[PDB]
Amino acid sequence: TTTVGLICDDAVILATDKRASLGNLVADKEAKKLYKIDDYIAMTIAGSVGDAQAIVRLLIAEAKLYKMRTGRNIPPLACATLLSNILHSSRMFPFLTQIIIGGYDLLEGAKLFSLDPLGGMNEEKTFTATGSGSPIAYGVLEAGYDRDMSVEEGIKLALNALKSAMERDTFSGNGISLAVITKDGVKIFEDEEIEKILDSMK
Amino acid sequence: TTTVGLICDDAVILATDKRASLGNLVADKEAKKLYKIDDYIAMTIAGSVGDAQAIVRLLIAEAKLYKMRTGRNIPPLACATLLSNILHSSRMFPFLTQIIIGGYDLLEGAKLFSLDPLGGMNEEKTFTATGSGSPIAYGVLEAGYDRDMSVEEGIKLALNALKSAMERDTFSGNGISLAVITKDGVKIFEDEEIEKILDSMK
Amino acid sequence: TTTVGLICDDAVILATDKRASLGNLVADKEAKKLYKIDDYIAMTIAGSVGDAQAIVRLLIAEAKLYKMRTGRNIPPLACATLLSNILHSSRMFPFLTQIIIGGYDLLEGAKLFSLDPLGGMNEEKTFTATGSGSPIAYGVLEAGYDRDMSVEEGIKLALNALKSAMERDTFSGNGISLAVITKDGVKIFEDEEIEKILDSMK
Amino acid sequence: TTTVGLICDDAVILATDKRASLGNLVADKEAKKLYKIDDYIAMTIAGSVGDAQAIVRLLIAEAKLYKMRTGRNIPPLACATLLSNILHSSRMFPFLTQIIIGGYDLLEGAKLFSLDPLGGMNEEKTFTATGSGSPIAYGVLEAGYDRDMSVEEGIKLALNALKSAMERDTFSGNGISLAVITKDGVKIFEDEEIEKILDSMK
Amino acid sequence: TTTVGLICDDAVILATDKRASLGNLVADKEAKKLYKIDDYIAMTIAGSVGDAQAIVRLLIAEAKLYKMRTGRNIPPLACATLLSNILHSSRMFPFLTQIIIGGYDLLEGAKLFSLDPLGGMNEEKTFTATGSGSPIAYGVLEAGYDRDMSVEEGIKLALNALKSAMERDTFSGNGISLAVITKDGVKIFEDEEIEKILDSMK
Amino acid sequence: TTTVGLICDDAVILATDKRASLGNLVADKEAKKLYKIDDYIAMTIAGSVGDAQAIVRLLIAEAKLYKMRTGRNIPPLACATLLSNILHSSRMFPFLTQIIIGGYDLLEGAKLFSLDPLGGMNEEKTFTATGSGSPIAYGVLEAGYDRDMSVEEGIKLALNALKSAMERDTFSGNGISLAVITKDGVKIFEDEEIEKILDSMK
Amino acid sequence: TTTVGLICDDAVILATDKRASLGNLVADKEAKKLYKIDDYIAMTIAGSVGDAQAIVRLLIAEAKLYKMRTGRNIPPLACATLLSNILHSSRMFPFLTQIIIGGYDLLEGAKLFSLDPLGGMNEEKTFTATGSGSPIAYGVLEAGYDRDMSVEEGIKLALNALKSAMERDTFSGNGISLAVITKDGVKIFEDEEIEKILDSMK
Amino acid sequence: TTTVGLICDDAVILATDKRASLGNLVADKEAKKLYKIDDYIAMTIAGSVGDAQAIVRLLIAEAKLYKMRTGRNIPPLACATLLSNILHSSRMFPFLTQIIIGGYDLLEGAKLFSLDPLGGMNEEKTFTATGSGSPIAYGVLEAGYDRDMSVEEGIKLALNALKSAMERDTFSGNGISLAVITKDGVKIFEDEEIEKILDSMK
Amino acid sequence: TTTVGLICDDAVILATDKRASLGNLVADKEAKKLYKIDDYIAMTIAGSVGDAQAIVRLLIAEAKLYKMRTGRNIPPLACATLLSNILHSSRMFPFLTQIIIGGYDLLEGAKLFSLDPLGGMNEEKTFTATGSGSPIAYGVLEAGYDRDMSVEEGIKLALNALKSAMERDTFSGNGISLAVITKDGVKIFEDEEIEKILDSMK
Amino acid sequence: TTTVGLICDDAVILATDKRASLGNLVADKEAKKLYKIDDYIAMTIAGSVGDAQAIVRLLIAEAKLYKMRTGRNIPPLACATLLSNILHSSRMFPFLTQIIIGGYDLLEGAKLFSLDPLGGMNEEKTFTATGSGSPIAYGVLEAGYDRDMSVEEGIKLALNALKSAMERDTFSGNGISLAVITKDGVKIFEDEEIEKILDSMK
């Protein structure tokens, strides 16, 4: 339970922690928290699994539909304003969970949106992160981030948020996943190759 | 969480604080709290995000519709009386959130409306503010407001309220936004330019 | 319930509000909230009446005793750390309440101290206020206060903090009392004269 | 929150306190609490704003309707029994709020009705009041009232209740609105002229 | 439970309500609420009977003692500051009950002191009333009082407060007792004679 | 809230207390607690006003209807068993309120029915009372009643209960009204003539 | 649990109800609730037995002690004020129970006192009663009582209170005990002879 | 409420945030959170003010005491193991509050200590931090620290922990205080010179 | 209440514990916890018997139906994604209980899925387990498992988790049950034969 | 918080995990949980830090004193039954926390004692563990322990428990620490060397 989103020049970087946290017990030694909904968009779930779980499937299906009914791949800032709506439906109700959506706007460029359980949404121009061990990761960014950085200088800083949080949060910190959305697509990093990085790092 | 409205001569001014406040954690370094719904009206959200979030959208439509179904741009003191009703509906229900709406009536001139989560609505003739750190902001105005203080001496005083509150409230105070509605329109100030002012102040 | 304190040049100013408040009812149209313990130090009680009330008597005596036994009028920052200890003796216990002590140190000059019901103490180099109607007062000061504003520009600002709180708090604002401690003494303004100022103001 | 109703010879008097009360804060230096529904009837809310707020609107309508549907301007003692019912409707439900209606029945004359949030209704032959600061106002009336006290000795007495309450109730006491329903119509006093009275008084 | 105090020129007046209130039931058709401790001072008890009850006897003793050990009938403002302490002894403890003491100070003249169960003390320069139905009695005063109202205009106004509350309070209002302390002594009015006034009145 | 009913020979008597009770405050110096539904039957509400209030109207309408659809003035013991059902419909629900109905059944004669808010009903052949201040009234009866005490000895005994309870109950005892149903009709006593009796009494 | 006290010319009467009440069960077909402590004084307990039980014994001794220590049989209005203190001793503590003491003072005549478990005390000049079925008994007295009702018209009025209550209170009403304290002594009525009276009545 | 500590080669660094936090309101624009008790040791308080306030004084005394009674300046890890004890004395009790102490041991060298409100102690060989915004600050350290980072690379890093935490924490971030203890002494940095650093940085 | 699953080369293993635990009493010396739903998949419940019981049935039909409607034996990772759905429907509602599904995908091979009462789902590539005494079982696997192991070293380890749990858990551990799914089928081990193994083990 | 102890041939092994867990945050990357109290006994705390902390010191003292007072190094099972007693003294009191003591008795040999916060104690002949993630460690033991497993096979097992716990427990497992007591002494392993083992392991 720990995610990070940030814009660095061209596109947007997203990373999580493959750690499922069943009270005292470590339940999953590898649990996805990073999903690609559409060819230009993807997201990170934080918090109530079975809840976000559905919120993913109960959404991708609304994307890979809008794409069809009207060509354009659900423009991110539009697909987002669903979630803002989807959640808030369950305000009167019990809903819950965190969420970051990061995808490339057909035209308007890269976009990064943050999302609270109720339905609060904000476009994060700089960087944002969420999770059990968010404020740990946060501190990393708020003092290691510059408007420009790079394609490279992003995914580095990126890990190094998780690197701290993951070893300073009881609940986050088992394995790590990462994908980057850019104009031409979305790359899920197959674990093995991820690792390369912090090796070349410190 | 801190906003401000006041009538000053010609038109009406509004301001917020782009700070989002996830309990202990500062969550958004730039959260919009000031929205224009119609070419002649604008409002300010204080409180429950994803709640006030929807009430915006679930109100803007209603405008850029009334506008259409009947020419006159939803006269402000009518649109307001919608929220008094749009709110009160969820009294039996869990609604909540603050709100200031101001706009230049086709004819009756400038108008400024406070508003509570229940549905209580009041026309403010002078100046009113809302937000976690509002009572701070309040002192400012109620010892810095005259009946007729220029198109300038208002947006000055406006800031200064936030200046205070922002730096004397755990919850408010990260960046600032502002717009002034007047007969001929509604001006969203692009961050950069706001600044000039408190530079030209103290 | 709404007190202020501030250091303007020479010495330090103090101001209360003669308003006692019994839940709904207004109980005292004139309650002293400003007490002078020792010829060079004066203090303001805020909150739990008969609890503060004693902490007064149960202290003045300690002063006009120290003074005697060792000449030197209990230097302020030394009387204060008394309260820090006096209070914190009833930490285990149910003590409670607010308090501002401001005195002229024989030689160290002007001093201003803030105080919480536990024992938390702090020297205010600038200004501080306390009370049910505090964060109103506070908004006035934080944006109407300069390192060096006369003995005049201080008692003015002193009033306009109370002027705000008093008529933007349900609990502050029946009458006002004001005294100023300065090297040679401590003036307890006798109502009538106080009023002279907001007349000569706006 | 503090309203008064009383009968004096000819017709009936109503007066409020333009004071809004967000707990500690004072939220509206100027809030209407006296509404005229029908050309011959007028009412004063006391208590939950947005609840009362609607109950005005969700009633005025039924008035200027019954009026059209059957000539006669909804005779007061009948409109009232609506409320008795309109309220008791949300008995099974969370309704709430006080009220006083006073009107001149086409023929029966002056009438004045007390009203609790449940639906409890009682015609007041003499004088009645209600609101946060009601029992203050009361003492005044119960010892400043005689069967036949002129049109004048009415509205004089009236302010003087509010005069007491507004200045002995943490929650009442900011401004005062007054109107008088009499056979020929319903006079809403525009702030300025009202004051004239306590000038001519003591 | 509803007592009054007020300072009219010469000396000071005190009035009670001989009405005891055992919850639903009216338990005593005649319960003294006004007590003379010392030939120059007198007090009224409000609320917790068997508590105030002790606080009376547990005190008059203290007075007609100090009196002896040192001539000077225990000056009022000094006796009073006993209760300030007496009560606040049992803050740490479960104490409670209201109080008004009023005496003629050997020299300083007339005094009037209010007193809450914690121990909070204040001298009342004008008028002050305590008791289940106090807020009624108040309004009477706050709008029937002038600096210099005759020895007569005093006891007149004194009853008319209790006249009000006694018939607008479920707990007060079964009979009434009055005494006026003046330089030379303290007059307990023997029921029958009291009655006089409200008959020469209206 | 203190009503009485009792069968004295020919017919039946009912009496109330015009005293309304808003918690601490006495809110209505005259509140009708005795209603005549049909020319042969009358009732006395006790307790939840706004609730009983409806229950009178939402009933008389049934009476003067049955009365129409089939001549016979809805027999008492039959309208009674309505209530029994009427009430118990809202058992599943939140209903409440006390009740006594007494009428002259076309043939069966005089009737008297007790009634609790759930739906429990009993024919009282003797006498019965309900009201915040009932049990007092009761004692009067249970030791001032005989099978055959005249139409007179009836309404003498009837006041003298109230006499008691009205000055031994915090909640009852402001004004009194009385009506007697007998074969030929139902007598509402206009206050004035009522009094006549306790004058002729002791 | 139901007792009575009242003054009738010469002396003072006291009556109880031998009925014990273990919640649902009826636990003593015959329990004393009237105790003679001193040759000139007698008292009635209502409420927590084992508590009162003590308060009797832990008092009796104090009388038949003071007696010896100083000739005069503890004057009632003095012994009484013990209790006032004996109770208020366990205010800080969980003491509880009612009481009526009545005796003939060596010189001052007859005396009758009411007593609440806190320590609240009042001389009753007229008539008073207390206990589970007190308010019932009261009604009787409040309308069957006159300043000067014989030695007989007293003890008669007496039973008849109990008569009502004992047959209208779930908790009182099993057998009855009575005694009368008059100058020369205190008479304990042995059940049989008591009886005689209501045989001679109605 | 955000302190940090860390061991960099020679000696040890410590840093706070002069931000006090009365819940919603920011109470102190400059609250000391760093204290030097003895020429060779210094500590930081985080959390319960008036509790740790004491704990400081209530310890300083015992340092500059031990020192005398036996020359040697109270060795750090011996001073520490007082707190461990000075806290756990109030386990049975309501004590509370965080803490770091750090000094240069006579011979053993630089020492740093972590301390929880119970009495939890550990020696921190690397770096540690505490307070409302602690984990934010942590993150910084955990990915920005090396065993042997210059005296300089460590006061750099420290700020930046705070830089972070202070603007990612509703409760931290008003001003910054820093000191460094090393063999020869303890340097408290006077606000102005602190500043130099993040000017020469980013 | 203690199940296990893990993939070993070819296929997948499952095991339970035939113990049901009725609070303090052992209620079932043999309760099935392992269910085959379709010829190529098998699942294990843990926890709320009669809820899961249903979820078995209310599932085996949705299997052997899809199977018919479209040949393909409801592929595992889809069937599962029913349960991720079937559960969450009753998120809003009171649904609960553990679960592990695992069967041979037609083509994709061996699959293993965990599942929580809310409907979170996580494919396990290695091994996982659930139930009152899970973690005990866990510790065994996590330190006795290798990517390959074998068909044999599989079911050997598997028991050996249960051997621990069942003898270190108050709620697990009455007998064991075992089945393996592999491409061609799904063996349910008939008590007797299971045994063999820990005979040929330690 | 996850400790272990098991007897193996000659002597006794212990082990912990240097992980401290301030709720959600990891507060100590290395916190000591394994303590030597006497040259022949060693112990391991688990759980409540500053309490246990104390129970160590407030114990080691009692060791090396008995030592001196009477030569024989406090024999373990006697030492132990201190703690059974030292604990329970504060059952009446809030004590708490886990514990295992392990020492070579002068003659009887090797001893291993488990201990609960109330004071229960059991010597373990085989193996026992404790701390938040204890049972995980447990399952490793109960299935990897033989009566006679060398000095080596023990400490190998030992870590191996920890290996699971630490890697399946939210609150255990930041680094590890180890010590073996044996006739001639007590080896506290200094991190670096420990490591060697799981290198020569799997």
From Swiss-Prot, chains A, B, C, D, E, F, G, H, I, J:
Keyword vocabulary terms for this entry: Autocatalytic cleavage, Cytoplasm, Hydrolase, Protease, Proteasome, Threonine protease, Zymogen
Major localisation: cytoplasm
Record-listed E.C. numbers: 3.4.25.1
GO process annotations (BP): proteasomal protein catabolic process; proteasome-mediated ubiquitin-dependent protein catabolic process
Activity regulation behaviour: The formation of the proteasomal ATPase PAN-20S proteasome complex, via the docking of the C-termini of PAN into the intersubunit pockets in the alpha-rings, triggers opening of the gate for substrate entry. Interconversion between the open-gate and close-gate conformations leads to a dynamic regulation of the 20S proteasome proteolysis activity.
Catalytic residues (UniProt): T1
Gene Ontology CC: cytosol; proteasome core complex, beta-subunit complex
Keyword field contains Cell division: no
Compartments (UniProt record): Cytoplasm
GO MF entries: endopeptidase activity; threonine-type endopeptidase activity
InterPro entries from the UniProt entry: Ntn_hydrolases_N, Pept_T1A_Psome_bsu_arc, Pept_T1A_subB, Proteasome_bsu_CS, Proteasome_sua/b, Proteasome_suB-type
Catalytic reaction annotation: Cleavage of peptide bonds with very broad specificity
Keyword hit for Nucleotide-binding: no
Gene3D superfamilies assigned to the protein according to its UniProt record, in alphabetical order: Glutamine Phosphoribosylpyrophosphate, subunit 1, domain 1
Protein role: Component of the proteasome core, a large protease complex with broad specificity involved in protein degradation. The M.jannaschii proteasome is able to cleave oligopeptides after Glu, Asp, Tyr, Phe, Trp, slightly after Arg, but not after Ala. Thus, displays caspase-like and chymotrypsin-like activities and low level of trypsin-like activity.
Cross-referenced PANTHER family: ATP-DEPENDENT PROTEASE SUBUNIT HSLV, METALLOPROTEASE TLDD
Subunit structure: The 20S proteasome core is composed of 14 alpha and 14 beta subunits that assemble into four stacked heptameric rings, resulting in a barrel-shaped structure. The two inner rings, each composed of seven catalytic beta subunits, are sandwiched by two outer rings, each composed of seven alpha subunits. The catalytic chamber with the active sites is on the inside of the barrel. Has a gated structure, the ends of the cylinder being occluded by the N-termini of the alpha-subunits. Is capped at one or both ends by the proteasome regulatory ATPase, PAN.
Protein name in the entry: Proteasome subunit beta
Lineage: Archaea, Methanobacteriati, Methanobacteriota, Methanomada group, Methanococci
The gene coding this protein: psmB
